[PDB]
Structure 1
Amino acid sequence: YVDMVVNAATMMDKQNDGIELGRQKIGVMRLNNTFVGDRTYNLRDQKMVIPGIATAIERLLQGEEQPLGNIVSMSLQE
């Protein structure tokens, strides 16, 4: 019984290296109060830029290594 258990479990664990959990999903989110794109205001004296949300967020997250959590103003599976 011991031998069988140890072998079986080791093989189960190795074969599950071929399975994948991390299916991506796509969210489509309409902005209700502002333009999505970035804007440029050519002041007669100076050109000035206001970035879009996409640009700002990408620049913020770029190169992160750790997870996200707590945006503010079975256990093994989770």
Structure 2
Amino acid sequence: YVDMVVNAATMMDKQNDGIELGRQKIGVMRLNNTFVGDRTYNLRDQKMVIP
């Protein structure tokens, strides 16, 4: 019983090693209150950039 338990546990672990967890999804999110672009303006002293 001890021998079997040890072998089976060890091998199962080595197998599950290769199982994949990193599955990327893609989200889509509309901006309702602003523009997506880098609006940009010219001031008396300093070129002003909105990231």
TM-score normalised to the size of structure 1?
0.59
TM-aligned CA deviation for residue 43 of structure 1: 2.2
Which ranges of 4 or more aligned residues in structure 1 deviate by more than 4 Å? none
Mapped to 2, the partners of 1:19 and 1:37 lie a distance apart of 41
TM-aligned CA deviation for residue 45 of structure 1: 4.0
TM-aligned CA deviation for residue 17 of structure 1: 1.3
Structure 2 unaligned spans of 5+: none
Aligned residues: 51
**Amino-acid identity (%):** 100
Mapped to 1, the partners of 2:46 and 2:6 lie a distance apart of 72
Mapped to 2, the partners of 1:12 and 1:37 lie a distance apart of 51
TM-aligned CA deviation for residue 44 of structure 1: 4.5
TM-score normalised to the size of structure 2?
0.85
Mapped to 1, the partners of 2:34 and 2:11 lie a distance apart of 54
RMSD (CA atoms):
1.2
Which of 1 and 2 has greater Rg? Answer: 2
Higher RCO (C-alpha under 8 Å, 6+ residues apart):
2
